[PDB]
């Protein structure tokens, strides 16, 4: 029912790469789980149309590249595949892509101190 497909902790890590992110609700990873799933589904089908257009039974990277270049909703991907406001936001996204921190960063060191102090059984609180 709510034992999810992909890991939520990984979605949180990917989110925390943005420095403009302080607190993440529990709703957000669960939403992104199915959001990413539906994204995979749409993109895979859009690429499979091109694979069928080449009479092939295997999905290769060039199929996904063609699917990316055909539709504008995936314009943000053009920089990652071998090939009036929303576009400016896409370039803002590109600039933010360079500034990603995957290092363990503490934001509320008070919570950290309490966690160093809290009583833990088997590592759990």
């Amino acid at each position: 029912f709510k034992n999810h497909s992909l890991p939520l902790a990984r979605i949180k890590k990917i989110m925390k790469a943005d420095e403009d992110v302080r607190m993440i609700s529990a709703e957000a990873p669960v939403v992104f789980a199915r959001a990413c799933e539906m994204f995979i589904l749409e993109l895979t089908l859009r690429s499979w149309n091109h694979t069928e257009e080449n009479k092939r039974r295997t999905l290769q990277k060039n199929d996904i590249a063609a699917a990316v270049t055909r539709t504008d909703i995936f314009d943000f991907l053009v920089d990652i595949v071998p090939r009036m406001d929303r576009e400016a936001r896409v370039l803002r996204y590109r600039e933010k892509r360079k500034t990603r921190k995957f290092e363990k960063t503490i934001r509320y060191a008070s919570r950290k101190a309490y966690a160093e102090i809290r009583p833990r059984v088997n590592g759990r609180f």
């Binding site: 943005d18 992110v21 995979i40 290769q60 995936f74 929303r86 995957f102």
Partner: protein
């Protein structure tokens, strides 16, 4: 650690494809990179809205407003249903 796990992504791709179909490994890698970049895309937009609305906690409605702003409209409504917990 910079992308989503590949086994789950590939299984999701398989769920979209017939049993006779096959998936290149390069395609799997490209797909996982694409989904992680989509996550960071939507997260940046949600953070933009939350800064503009003087909020510090990121909620589901923020994510959906971002996704709507980003053109993934047809995603939103079933995700609205998924929200109910």
């Amino acid at each position: 650690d910079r992308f989503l796990p590949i086994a789950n992504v590939s299984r999701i791709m398989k769920k979209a494809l017939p049993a006779n179909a096959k998936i290149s490994k390069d395609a799997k890698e490209t797909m996982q990179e694409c989904v992680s970049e989509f996550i960071s895309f939507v997260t940046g937009e949600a953070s933009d809205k939350c800064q503009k609305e003087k909020r510090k906690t990121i909620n589901g409605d923020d994510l959906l407003w971002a996704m709507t702003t980003l053109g993934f409209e047809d995603y939103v409504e079933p995700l609205k249903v998924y929200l109910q917990r």
